[PDB]
A paper describes a structure:
Here, we generated a novel vaccine platform, CTB-V2c, by scaffolding a mucosal-targeting, pentameric particle approaching the size of a typical virus-like particle (VLP) from cholera toxin B (CTB) onto the SIV V2c B-cell epitope, favoring an α-helical conformation of V2. An additional study in macaques demonstrated that V1-deleted (ΔV1) SIV envelope immunogens expose the spike-apical V2 region in an α-helical conformation (designated V2c) and elicit anti-V2c Abs mediating potent ADCC and correlating with decreased risk of SIVmac251 acquisition. Significantly, V2c includes peptide positions 164 to 181 (based on HXBC2 strain numbering), which were targeted for immune selection in the human vaccinees of RV144 (25). We hypothesized that V2c, in isolation from the rest of the HIV/SIV envelope, could elicit functional, non-neutralizing Abs that contribute to vaccine efficacy.
Accordingly, we designed a V2c SIVsmE543-based peptide with the sequence DKKIEYNETWYSRD and scaffolded it on cholera toxin subunit B (CTB-V2c). V2c structural analysis predicted the peptide would take an α-helical conformation and suggested its potential to be stable in vivo. We expressed CTB-V2c in E. coli and purified it by galactose affinity chromatography to select for stable CTB pentamers, as these are the only CTB forms that bind to galactose and mucosal GM1 gangliosides. Moreover, purification of the immunogen also removed endotoxins, which do not bind galactose resin. Gel filtration revealed a pure pentameric fraction of this CTB-V2c chimeric vaccine immunogen. Liquid chromatography-mass spectrometry (LC-MS) confirmed the composition of the molecule, and crystallographic resolution of the structure confirmed a pure, stable pentamer with a dynamic C-terminal peptide insert, consistent with a flexible α-helix DKKIEYNETWYSRD peaked six weeks following the first immunization. Taken together, these data suggested that our CTB-V2c vaccine was successfully immunogenic. Point mutations in the V2c peptide probe revealed that the reactivity of polyclonal sera was dependent on amino acid Y177 within the V2 loop (HXBC2 numbering), which is an amino acid conserved between HIV and SIV viruses and is indispensable for CH58 binding to its B-cell epitope. Indeed, the polyclonal serum Abs elicited by our V2c design were dependent on the V2 loop amino acid Y177, which suggests a focused elicitation in vivo of CH58/CAP228-like, non-neutralizing antibodies in isolation from any other distracting, anti-HIV/SIV Abs. The 5xCTB-V2c/alum group showed no neutralizing antibody responses, suggesting, as suspected, that V2c is not a neutralization epitope.
Author numbering:
A (entry chain G), C (entry chain E), D (entry chain D), E (entry chain H): 1 to 107
B (entry chain F): 1 to 108
Write the structure that this text describes.
Amino acid sequence: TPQNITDLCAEYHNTQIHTLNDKIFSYTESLAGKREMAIITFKNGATFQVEVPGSQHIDSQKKAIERMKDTLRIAYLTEAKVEKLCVWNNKTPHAIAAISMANDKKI
Amino acid sequence: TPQNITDLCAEYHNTQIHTLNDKIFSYTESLAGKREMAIITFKNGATFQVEVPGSQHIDSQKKAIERMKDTLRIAYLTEAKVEKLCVWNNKTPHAIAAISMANDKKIE
Amino acid sequence: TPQNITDLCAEYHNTQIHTLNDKIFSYTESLAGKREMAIITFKNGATFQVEVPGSQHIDSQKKAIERMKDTLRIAYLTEAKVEKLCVWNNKTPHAIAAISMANDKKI
Amino acid sequence: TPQNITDLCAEYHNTQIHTLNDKIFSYTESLAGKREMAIITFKNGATFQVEVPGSQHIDSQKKAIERMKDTLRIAYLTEAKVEKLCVWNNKTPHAIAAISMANDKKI
Amino acid sequence: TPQNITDLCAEYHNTQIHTLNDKIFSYTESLAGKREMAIITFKNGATFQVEVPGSQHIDSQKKAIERMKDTLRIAYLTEAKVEKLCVWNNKTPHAIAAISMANDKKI
Ligand SMILES: OC[C@H]1O[C@@H](O)[C@H](O)[C@@H](O)[C@H]1O
Ligand SMILES: OC[C@H]1O[C@@H](O)[C@H](O)[C@@H](O)[C@H]1O
Ligand SMILES: OC[C@H]1O[C@@H](O)[C@H](O)[C@@H](O)[C@H]1O
Ligand SMILES: OC[C@H]1O[C@@H](O)[C@H](O)[C@@H](O)[C@H]1O
Ligand SMILES: OC[C@H]1O[C@@H](O)[C@H](O)[C@@H](O)[C@H]1O
Ligand SMILES: [Cl-]
Ligand SMILES: [Cl-]
Ligand SMILES: [Cl-]
Ligand SMILES: [Cl-]
Ligand SMILES: [Cl-]
């Protein structure tokens, strides 16, 4: 089992780490058919999505996808500082796989 | 896959964007039979709903409909600034498809 | 489709609007068998319930009942001002059908 | 239908009211097998549980039990004043059946 | 039935108590297939996980695992002081079984 987001990311193909050390700039969610997703951006312009659930996901991910959208909403609303995101880069926008938050970390 | 609410809205018929850049003024929710819905207004009278679930909605939307109602309630309570709404304009009040929030975006 | 709580209320038999313009004074919830319900009161003495789910409710209402209890709890804990309640008056206490909140509204 | 926690409590065998008028001192929760429960204590030492779900619970209580655990967590974190608890006194620690909160009530 | 996290811990093999009396330093969560988990750390370098649901877990634990992840996220965001963690020591990082929070306690 990995002990941090960097080592978790390294277990998967087509993933990279983005280091943000920043709060989320915008949050978007949709209930439109076939676009039931969230999108977040950072102030520089970096954009990310939580993918629409689909056949690329296994059953255990269904709940985790819903959790990630809860997490991003509350993070946005509390202006919580996001440390890193693990993403799949074979999607546009990049698709969120994991998130870390560590407000007090010296950078 | 769209990158923002405006491009998202352009994928659908009978939709438009409202640019609000303002907090929600009132939040109403109902459990009454056949009116299981939410209604929000902004200070000068602009009014929106989250539709009662029905045969126009597919199963993948059911969770997202419940999520939107949660988002609107917490936005109302925290006085969070709503940037845009994507709505269907073939309903009255206009029916919410998507929402974006971006507090620090400089308005022009 | 109604655009406000007053118009929504007028659609049903056995309903009325209470205008409170006040925060909730007390919140009570129960997990006891056949009394899985919530009760709120206001400082003016008014008492209301969120009814136990039963045969008088249709399937589409089950989720909304749980949502109403969530909404009343967070309103209570944040001292959110409640504008109006739409209630059924053929139950004692009066059974909540809809709630509206509008902090800045002038009175 | 009862109008308050005291009258609700008196409808059940093996129950009693505790008048606390105080915030929760500690909150404990467990995911360990057969001990999927919550425990709260007050500064006077009073200790209570939200029981592990079981065959003594009817289906309508499962959701209410999960809600009660949500309510206690948020009450703990916001330091909300608990007015009264209704508890089953045939379990040790006594098992929570209902809760009431009423911050502005005189004591 | 145990009345506290220490006595709860002593009912299970391969467990131990960590006393932290400190807020969570970082929170990490993942939706990646087969790594649907959460990881928290403390200032002192100590790292803990909430395990991916699996065949080591009984059905009644599934809801409680999801609840624990909710509790840790909200604790991290509010800077709530964690008192003790009960963990399994036959996993790396140590797997969380229970958590207690008691802000006003004398150390
Ligand atoms: O688990 C979800 C992931 O599934 C992979 O197969 C896909 O390449 C990724 O882009 C992401 O969708
Ligand atoms: O997905 C929900 C939408 O479904 C469409 O068919 C309808 O025209 C819209 O008004 C909206 O109800
Ligand atoms: O939908 C809930 C309502 O159902 C009605 O039939 C009943 O008369 C009301 O008191 C209320 O229970
Ligand atoms: O519904 C839960 C309750 O069920 C009763 O039968 C039992 O005596 C109580 O202690 C409590 O467990
Ligand atoms: O219930 C979860 C636990 O199950 C045990 O059998 C295992 O040894 C622990 O490490 C933990 O996984
Ligand atoms: Cl892979
Ligand atoms: Cl793509
Ligand atoms: Cl009617
Ligand atoms: Cl009884
Ligand atoms: Cl064991």
